[PDB]
C-alpha cells in the first residue's frame, strides 16, 4: 500500500519554521521533511480564514465554486469532496483533528438523509471518516458533540465543567486564581495540563493509534492529522511556555505610512480589537513567545510520530505533506488574526516528502512554482492511482514537481477570496451582504486585490517585499493593473460547475462530431429533407466508425 | 386556494402568435390571455436550447450556477429547485409534459438515494411531481421509461412497435408507403393519428384530468403544462396539416452580406444540415405551414382547457403563464434550430394572466421591462405567499409588473449562455471542451455576445432590428462594447453559490456587529488582553441588546 499523511497546523505562519528562515525557532523534524523532500515558497490558500480555506482544501474547488464562504457556513450537500475522489480509487480518507465542517442539515433533510446514518455522518464530516473529529475550540458552553479529548482528560483524572478550557487552555495563578488562556495577558502562563495530556500530544498519539488500527484493515489511507495549534487560545503546557522570550521575537513588519489614506477595507481591519491589541509591543512580546512554544511542541511531537512510523516501516510507503490553513499577522500590518491577503496570512508553508523512488531527483530542493492549496486534492488522487476529475477539481496535481527535476508548470496566477459580510467592514464600507467581495490574484511578483465598490489594492513584492506601498491608484502601475485585472476577468469566467459530465465523456464521439452527425446514432433526425439524405449520412457514420 | 398554470411550448417563436403580430396565424385563445393580462416584449431565456434553458427555468438559476449546460447533462443532486421552494410554502409542483430532466444517478448513488424512492423519483424529476412525464421525442429505439402516451395509443386501438413514431409522427402515403415525420419533406402530410388522440390533444386532456384530481386533494398547485409541439417532428394531424400554405409564410430574415466575414461561431452554425436545408426556400415553404398548424392546434386545445377551467371556477383563482423554452430560426439568419442569441431563438413569448384584483390595473397592457425566464421561479414563490430566497434564486419576482401600473424595475441587462462543446463548432474553432463559451448581454437596444477566444458579436437592434450588421469589431462601437463587457464582468462575479445561509440570517446581529463583537456572545474571545477588557465589551453587548 501507498499511504498519505496530510499534516496541517491551524494559523501557522510559513516564516515560523527554521527551514523557511526563522532565526530563533528550531524546527528540526519539520526541516528534515524538507531536507528529504520539496519545500514550496509560493503556496497560497484560496481563502485566509479557517472555514473557507479548509472547504477549498477538502473539495479542491475555489470558494466561488463551493460557496462555503465563511466560518460556519455549511458545505452544501452534494458538493463533491476529496473523500469521494479517494474512495473512487480505493483509498480511505480519515480525519484526526480539525476540519471546521458544518453539516448541511437542511440539504440532508430535503434528501431524506439521516444525519446520523453512515452516509449522513460522512456527508456532515465533509467526506472524512472521523477517527477523531475535534476542531479544538470549545468555549463554555458550545453546543455540539463532546470532543473525545474531554473524556480523555476526565479518564486521565482531570475533572472540570469544561476540561478543554480549564485544563488544556487555562493556568492557575500562584495564589490559586483562574488564569483564562483566552486572555492574551496569560500567554506567558503554563497550561494546567501536563504536556503529555495536552492537545498536541493527544492528537499526535491519536494519529499513532489510527495507524496501528489501519495497518490490519489493509486498505490504503490518506490520514489528515489536523492540529489546532498554534491557533488560539495562545497558551501551552510547560516546558514550552517559557522556552522563548521577548528577545526571540522578530520585529513587526509595518509602517506608519502604510496606514495613511489606506484602503478602506484594510483600515477597517486595523480597527478590530485583535488588531488594536497586536499593535502594542507589549502584546507581541507576551504572545509571540507562546506561539513559538506551540510550534516547538508540534515539531517535537512530529518527531515522535515520524519515529513511530519508521519503526513500523510506514516511512517507506507514506507520502507526508506538511502545511497550514493560513497564517497569523501577530501585529504585522497593524493587524491581528488573518484577514486580507498579505504574505503572513495567505502564503502557507508547504513541504511534501514522497519516499517513492520517483521523487529521488528533487530531494532537498526548493520550488517557487505557483501553487495553491486546492492542488492537494488532485495530487492525492494522482498519487492514489486515479485520474483526477478536472471537470470537478480546479487545481493541478503537484506530482510533476516532485517527480521531474525540470518539469513545465503552466500556472501564471494564483487566486484567493474573501467574503467579508460577517465583519464590521460590511457596515463601515456600506455594502449589501452579497456585495462584500475581495479577490486576490498573484503572479509571483505583483499581488492585486480587487474589492467590489472600491479601488484595487496592489503590491510589487520584488520592490516592496513587505507590502508597505499600495499601488492600487498609482498611475504608474496602470499596465500591471490591467494585466492582473484581465487575469481576474478570465478566472471568474473559468467555472467548473458542469460536474455531472466529464470531458472524457465527449471524446469517443469526436470523429463523428467532426465530419458527421452524432444525433443520427440515437435515431434523432434533425434537419433532414428525405430518406436518401438520412441514409447517406448513416453510411458516412458507418464509414467513420470503421476508420476508428 | 390560489393556483398557477404554467404553460410552455417547446421551440415556439414569439412572433408566431397573432398578439405578437403574426399576420396569417390567428391565435385567439392565447391572445385573450394577453387581452386580460400582461404581454412581455423583452423576455429572454438563459440558454436557447431545451435542456439548459429548462434547467434555468426550473431552478431560477443561471447556467453558470447550475452547471447543466447541454441537453442530457444531469442536473446535480442537491441543486435547489422550484419544487423545493414551492413545497416550503405549501404549494405542489406538478408536471404534465416535458422537462428534459436527466437524473443525477451518480450523485444519488453516492448519497444512497434510491432513484425509485419517493425522494429519489422527485430528485430525478427536477423537483416535479410527475403526473405525466413525457419529453415528446421517442425514436426507435430510445431507452427510457415508456411514455404513458404509447400505452394510451395502444389502448385506443393504435398498435405499432413505436406508437408515438408510427401513429403520432408519421403519415401513410396514398399507396401505403410509410412517410416518416422525422423527414422535412413530409411536413405536408397528415399524421396517421386522429386529432383527438394526437400529442397536443392528449396532453391537454391530461392537464384537465390532473385538475379534476387536484381539486379534492385540496392543496394549492403549480401545474406545468409543457407541450412538445411545435418542436419537431414537424408533422401534425388533420385538419391542421393543410390549414396553411406557402403564401402564409412570412419572408426569411437574412442577407447575403451577413454571411460575409461572419463571426466564426455563426459561420459554423450555418454549416449544419438543418441550417443548409432551412436555407432553401423549398424547405421553408413546406415546413413552416406545419409549424403554423401545430401552433393553431395548441391554441384550439388551450381554448378547450380554458373553457374547462371556467366551468369549474378555476379561472377565478389560477394565474396562467404562457411561454416557450426558446424559439426556432426556420431559416432566419441562414440557420435552422436555435443556437446563438438572435431574437428568433432567445426572445420568447411571455404572457401572464393573474385573475386576482391586484392585477386589474395592468390588464391588456404590454411591458417592455427586461425580463428573464429565471424570473418565473421567484414570481411563483411570491404568488404562493413565500419570500423568494434570493441567495438561491437569481432573478426577480414579476409581481410588481402585474400589480403596479407604474412600478420601478431596476434590471438594466439580461443574460443568456451557450456551451457549444457538443457542437461541431468546438472542433472547427479549435477549442478545448471547457472553453466553448459564449455569453449574451442585452440592454434593450444593444446585444453583445462574448465568445471566448474570439471577437464579440454586437448588434444595435434600434438601427438594425434584423441583426444583420455585426459591430463586434467596428471601431465606432467601442464605447458600447466597453459598457456591455463591463456588465458581463460584473455579472460573472455576481455569483449565488452561498446557498446554505440566507442574507436574512445575518441581519439580527447587525447592531452588535456595528459597534461590538458578536463572537463574545458564544464565548469566543479573540484578541482581548485581560478580563476587564472582555467584561467591558460584554456590558456593551448587553447595552446594545437592550436598545434593540
Ligand atoms: Zn485556521
Ligand atoms: Zn426546447
Automatic annotation (TrEMBL), chains A, B:
Entry-linked CDD domains: PMH (cd16028)
Pfam families assigned to the protein according to its UniProt record, in alphabetical order: Sulfatase (PF00884)
Annotated GO CC locations: cytoplasm
Zinc in keyword set: yes
Domain Sulfatase N-terminal: 2-385
Domain of life: Bacteria
Molecular function in Gene Ontology: metal ion binding; sulfuric ester hydrolase activity
Keywords: Hydrolase, Metal-binding, Plasmid, Zinc
Positions contributing to Zn(2+) binding: 10, 50, 325-326
Name this polypeptide is given: Sulfatase family protein
Organism of provenance: Ruegeria pomeroyi (strain ATCC 700808 / DSM 15171 / DSS-3) (Silicibacter pomeroyi)
Amino acid at each position: 500500500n501507498r499511504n498519505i499523511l496530510w499534516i496541517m497546523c491551524d494559523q501557522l505562519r510559513f516564516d515560523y519554521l527554521s527551514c523557511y528562515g526563522h532565526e530563533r525557532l528550531n524546527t528540526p523534524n519539520i526541516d528534515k521533511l524538507a531536507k528529504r523532500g520539496v519545500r514550496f515558497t509560493n503556496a497560497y490558500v484560496q481563502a485566509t480564514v479557517a472555514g473557507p480555506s479548509r472547504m477549498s482544501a477538502y473539495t479542491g474547488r475555489y470558494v466561488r465554486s463551493h460557496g462555503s464562504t465563511q466560518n460556519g457556513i455549511p458545505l452544501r450537500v452534494g458538493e463533491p469532496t476529496l473523500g469521494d475522489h479517494l474512495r473512487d480509487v480505493g483509498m480511505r480518507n480519515v480525519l484526526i483533528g480539525k476540519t471546521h465542517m458544518r453539516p448541511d442539515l437542511d440539504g440532508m433533510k430535503r434528501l431524506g438523509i439521516d444525519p446520523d446514518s453512515e452516509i449522513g455522518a460522512r456527508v456532515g464530516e465533509g467526506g472524512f471518516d472521523a477517527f477523531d473529529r475535534d476542531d479544538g475550540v470549545h468555549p463554555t458552553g458550545y453546543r455540539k458533540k463532546e470532543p473525545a479529548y474531554n473524556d480523555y482528560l476526565r479518564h486521565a483524572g482531570f475533572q472540570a465543567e469544561n476540561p478543554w478550557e480549564f485544563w488544556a487552555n487555562s493556568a492557575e495563578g500562584k495564589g490559586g486564581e483562574n488564569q483564562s488562556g483566552w486572555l492574551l495577558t496569560h500567554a506567558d502562563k503554563p497550561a494546567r495540563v501536563p504536556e503529555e495530556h495536552s492537545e498536541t500530544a493527544y492528537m499526535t498519539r491519536r494519529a499513532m493509534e489510527f495507524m496501528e488500527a489501519a495497518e490490519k484493515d489493509g486498505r490504503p489511507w490518506c490520514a489528515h492529522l489536523s492540529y489546532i495549534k498554534p491557533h488560539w487560545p495562545y497558551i501551552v503546557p510547560a516546558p514550552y511556555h517559557d522556552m522563548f522570550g521577548p528577545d526571540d521575537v522578530k520585529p513587526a513588519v509595518r509602517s506608519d505610512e502604510e496606514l495613511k489614506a489606506a484602503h478602506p477595507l484594510f483600515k477597517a481591519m486595523t480597527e478590530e480589537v485583535y488588531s488594536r491589541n497586536f499593535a502594542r509591543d507589549e502584546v507581541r512580546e507576551k504572545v509571540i513567545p507562546a506561539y513559538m512554544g506551540l510550534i516547538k511542541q508540534i515539531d517535537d511531537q512530529l518527531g515522535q510520530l515520524f519515529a513511530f512510523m519508521q519503526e513500523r516501516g510506514l516511512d517507506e510507503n507514506t507520502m507526508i505533506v506538511f502545511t497550514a490553513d493560513h497564517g497569523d499577522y501577530l501585529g504585522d500590518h497593524w493587524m491581528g488574526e488573518k484577514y486580507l491577503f498579505y504574505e503572513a496570512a495567505a502564503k502557507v508553508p508547504l513541504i511534501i516528502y514522497d519516499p517513492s523512488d520517483k521523487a529521488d531527483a528533487t530531494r532537498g530542493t526548493v520550488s517557487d512554482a505557483l501553487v495553491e492549496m486546492i492542488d492537494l486534492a488532485p495530487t492525492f488522487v494522482d498519487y492514489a492511482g486515479g485520474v483526477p476529475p478536472m471537470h470537478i477539481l480546479e487545481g493541478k496535481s503537484l506530482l510533476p514537481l516532485l517527480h521531474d527535476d525540470d518539469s513545465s508548470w503552466d500556472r501564471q496566477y494564483v487566486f484567493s477570496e474573501l467574503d467579508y459580510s460577517n465583519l464590521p467592514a460590511r457596515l463601515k464600507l456600506g455594502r449589501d451582504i452579497q456585495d462584500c467581495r475581495a479577490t486576490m490574484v498573484f503572479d509571483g511578483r505583483y499581488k492585486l486585490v480587487e474589492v467590489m465598490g472600491f479601488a484595487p489594492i496592489l503590491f510589487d513584492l520584488e520592490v516592496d517585499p513587505d507590502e508597505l506601498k499600495d499601488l492600487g491608484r498609482d498611475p504608474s502601475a496602470e499596465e500591471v493593473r490591467q494585466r492582473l485585472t484581465s487575469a481576474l476577468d478570465a478566472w471568474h469566467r473559468n467555472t467548473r460547475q458542469r460536474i455531472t459530465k466529464s470531458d472524457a465523456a465527449y471524446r469517443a464521439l469526436d470523429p463523428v462530431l467532426r465530419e458527421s452527425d452524432p444525433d443520427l446514432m440515437a435515431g434523432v433526425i434533425i434537419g433532414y429533407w428525405d430518406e436518401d439524405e438520412v441514409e447517406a449520412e448513416k453510411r458516412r457514420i458507418a464509414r467513420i466508425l470503421g476508420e476508428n
